[PDB]
Design a protein around this ligand. Sequence first.
Ligand SMILES: Cn1ccc2cc[nH]c2c1=O
Length: 102
Amino acid sequence: STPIQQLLEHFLRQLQRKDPHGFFAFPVTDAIAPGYSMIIKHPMDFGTMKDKIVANEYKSVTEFKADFKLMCDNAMTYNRPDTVYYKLAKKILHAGFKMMSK
Ligand SMILES: Cn1ccc2cc[nH]c2c1=O
């Protein structure tokens, strides 16, 4: 694997530690989130991000960060603010960018 893949695998491991329940581990299904696919146009999750690293689809750290932000923004769009998912998305968006900045 390439230096970028190694760095992104490291960032991904550290980001997933901030989601110990694995709420962001796999794509959101409509079965657990009614109507999700009809509301969220560009779904994202950590498992898809892992597959993109392995496929070498991220050509910059910026692209990886954009998928992480997309994942969090989706949760803050579909869910109401008084939900576990909204609250965690907001928390990990900020904490995750901080972690990747230094
Ligand atoms: C990320 N995520 C995971 C599960 C779920 C159920 C309702 N909303 C959500 C959500 O946003």
